[PDB]
């Protein structure tokens, strides 16, 4: 892909009509079988920030996140706000982040992440205090991306993922924002 590609990249929210494209792209990006009800949810439910990067019409990347109250964090990560005592504290969970292979290393993943931060700053500037995500422990490309962007490793999650019939370990990564 041309090194001027980032300049031609646009952004838009996912919609219902994107389901088939999103399912196909996810099939390539993530070795995980998400059900059709999930694709329906992330393309329609306004509780999600589901953002696509597009190039000459077509989706070449996406980030899907949910801003939610601290009480909605699952037990395995219940301690990411252990030093924060405010009941109004929110967090943003990144459910999915991916970029088409040929378009990687052009800044699109960075743009998607930055756009989530901008959305948080615009929509939940006071209360959202962290961004967190899960990643396969073997996913060095993603781990380097996050660690170079101030995310810190927080939990080791043994056999967290089911990957084509076999269990695999995960990490939780966390970035504190607006003071934590």
């Amino acid at each position: 892909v041309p090194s001027s590609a980032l300049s031609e990249v646009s952004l838009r929210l996912l919609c219902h009509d994107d389901i088939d494209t999103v399912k196909h792209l996810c099939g390539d990006w993530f070795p995980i079988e998400y059900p059709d009800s999930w694709y329906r949810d992330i393309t329609s439910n306004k509780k999600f920030f589901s953002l696509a990067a597009t190039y000459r019409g077509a989706i070449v990347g996406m980030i899907v996140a949910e801003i939610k109250n601290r009480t909605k964090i699952h037990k395995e990560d219940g301690d990411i706000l252990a030093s924060n005592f405010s009941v109004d504290t929110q967090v943003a969970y990144i459910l999915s982040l991916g970029v088409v292979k040929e378009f990687r290393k052009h800044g699109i993943g960075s743009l998607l992440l930055e756009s989530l931060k901008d959305h948080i700053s615009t929509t939940a500037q006071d209360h959202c205090k962290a961004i967190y995500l899960h990643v396969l422990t073997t996913n060095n490309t993603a781990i380097n991306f996050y660690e170079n962007r101030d995310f810190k490793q927080h939990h080791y999650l043994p056999y967290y993922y089911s990957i084509r019939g076999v269990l695999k370990d995960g990490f939780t990564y966390v970035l504190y924002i607006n003071g934590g």
Binding site: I32, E33, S96, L133, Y160, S162, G170
Partner: peptide
């Protein structure tokens, strides 16, 4: 990448 959320788990299922």
């Amino acid at each position: 990448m959320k788990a299922v």
